[PDB]
Design a protein around this ligand. Structure first.
Ligand SMILES: O[C@@H]1[C@@H](O)[C@H](O[C@@H]2CO[C@@H](O[C@@H]3CO[C@@H](O)[C@H](O)[C@H]3O)[C@H](O)[C@H]2O)OC[C@H]1O
Ligand SMILES: [Ca+2]
Ligand code: NA
Ligand code: NA
Length: 487
């Protein structure tokens, strides 16, 4: 193992991923997994190949990763949401949309079946929705135009009609929160900074792809963007990013996550405080806050973004954002403690079972690979593979539990022009070697075989490292999934 981690270091849980970016995260919790959906931040370049600042040019997909344990993330690739103009090479789903910013996600049981709803902003003018029968697609545009526009009743007044947050209440009623911006164009007055009156909530129809009635204004003091809604102990918590302009009182600090409570989903809301500092307070930082509060496996968390990967690569964030999660604590009085955002992140919640098929693109740490959509036969929806594998690269999973009996063999599904090796190591990238898998030439990068090799000494709970070696100077092979067999 020679390659180093970019930003998510072995033993740490933030950023969630560092083999690519992901901005504006939101969480769905569903049947033992947490799914994180993100705007498609993607490095932009000058014509001479040098990196430039993020201009949001490429925000036309939604990236999706998921975990059962907070440490190992399955990369589910990208949903080609935007279909207008050039976007997504004709494969875009929402043909009316040139952009798909800042996703929101909901599940609702309809006609005895779980149905999933992905919301997004077509830049600053309109919210769209796609539907699917699984949290990872495939996705359908059931409307063919925006769900919400400035003409939706109650939506006039909104400066930036974006950053949707959709919540399905306990009674099954869906609600959409959206909006932000500050009125007064180039020079808002002090009062316009303090009360933009640009946040909205509107009830959704039963189908989750329509609205009922008109939108209500939520008077979020110093509103900026990044609506969020969670419900704790019967109270609805509307959270949002506080703006950066005007003078601010001590209790509404610029760029921080403010929150309000109500006994009803549409209000009236009352400001209660703030619980997440600007990312640059912790990682410095740079730039805008975006967040979502969620409960997964019976603990409260917040997912948010920071410029921690681009920072480590370039020596500046440059507007490129990565997801992080930390714990969130409600007090006895219903108030929320300041979130202690950091790199350590959340300690692994459960062990990984190495005797099922595990996607190669399910990993906790890597140095340094990419994931992309795979040509491998079979596999889960939107199956990906690990690629850009060179000599000395590796990926690793957290706490695989081999059990006291331990493993007998190791299978890997691979595609290779010239061949190479996968070393299986415990605990560290130079750790106990339990097996070495020889990847043959298979026919090339799109031709697949499952290879088996012997394993010995794999028992108990260990980080497992897959270390890639070979004589080539570029990509050695593509790696789709693996599985151990029990002794
Ligand atoms: O002070 C800085 C802030 O301005 C910054 O917030 C960003 C402001 O621009 C927003 O992008 C607009 C979204 O709406 C579209 O219609 C417009 O075309 C966009 O320009 C963006 O949402 C914010 O993140 O954050 C960093 C602060 O220091
Ligand atoms: Ca795969
Ligand atoms: Na969001
Ligand atoms: Na690599």
């Amino acid at each position: 193992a020679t390659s180093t981690t970019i930003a998510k270091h072995i033993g740490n849980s933030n950023p969630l991923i560092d083999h690519h970016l992901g901005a504006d995260p939101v969480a769905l919790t569903y049947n033992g997994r947490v799914y994180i959906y993100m705007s498609s931040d993607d490095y932009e370049y000058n014509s001479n190949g040098t990196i430039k600042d993020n201009s949001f040019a490429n925000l036309n997909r939604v990236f999706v990763i998921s975990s059962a344990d907070m440490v190992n993330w399955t990369d589910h690739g990208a949903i080609p949401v935007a279909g207008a103009n050039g976007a997504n090479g004709g494969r875009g789903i929402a043909k009316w949309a040139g952009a798909s910013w800042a996703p929101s996600i909901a599940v609702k049981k309809i006609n005895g079946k779980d149905k999933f709803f992905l919301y997004f902003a077509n830049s600053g003018g309109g919210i769209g929705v796609l539907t699917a029968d699984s949290p990872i697609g495939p996705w359908t545009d059931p409307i063919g135009k925006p769900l919400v526009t400035p003409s939706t009743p109650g939506m006039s007044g909104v400066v930036w009609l974006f950053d949707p947050a959709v919540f399905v209440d306990d009674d099954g009623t869906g609600y959409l929160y959206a909006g932000g911006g500050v009125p007064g164009v180039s020079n808002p007055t002090q009062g316009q900074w303090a009360n933009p009156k640009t946040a909205r909530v509107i009830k959704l129809g039963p189908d989750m792809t329509s609205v009922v009635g008109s939108a209500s204004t939520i008077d979020a003091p110093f509103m900026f963007e990044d609506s969020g809604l969670h419900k704790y102990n019967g109270t609805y918590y509307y959270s949002y990013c506080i703006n950066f302009g005007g003078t601010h009182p001590a209790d509404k600090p610029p760029g921080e996550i403010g929150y309000m409570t109500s006994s009803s989903p549409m209000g009236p809301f009352t400001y209660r405080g703030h619980f997440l500092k600007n990312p640059g307070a912790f990682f410095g930082g740079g730039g805008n806050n975006h967040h979502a509060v969620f409960n997964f496996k019976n603990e409260w968390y917040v997912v948010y973004h920071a410029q921690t990967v681009s920072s480590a690569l370039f020596g500046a964030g440059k507007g490129y954002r990565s997801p992080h999660i930390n714990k969130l604590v409600h007090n006895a009085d219903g108030s929320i403690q300041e979130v202690a955002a950091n790199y350590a992140g959340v300690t692994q919640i459960s062990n990984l079972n190495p005797y099922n098929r595990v996607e190669a693109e399910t990993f906790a740490w890597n140095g340094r690979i990419l994931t992309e959509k795979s040509t491998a036969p079979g596999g889960p929806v939107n199956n990906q593979h690990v690629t850009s594998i060179q000599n000395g690269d590796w990926i690793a999973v957290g706490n695989a539990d081999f059990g006291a009996g331990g493993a007998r063999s190791f299978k890997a599904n691979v595609a290779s022009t010239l061949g190479g090796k996968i070393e299986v190591r415990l605990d560290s990238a130079d750790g106990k070697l339990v097996g070495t898998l020889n990847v043959p030439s298979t026919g090339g990068a799109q031709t697949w075989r499952e290879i088996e090799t012997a394993v010995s000494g794999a028992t108990g709970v260990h980080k497992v490292f897959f270390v890639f070696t070979g004589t080539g100077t570029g990509n050695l092979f593509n790696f789709d999934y693996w599985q151990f067999t029990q002794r």
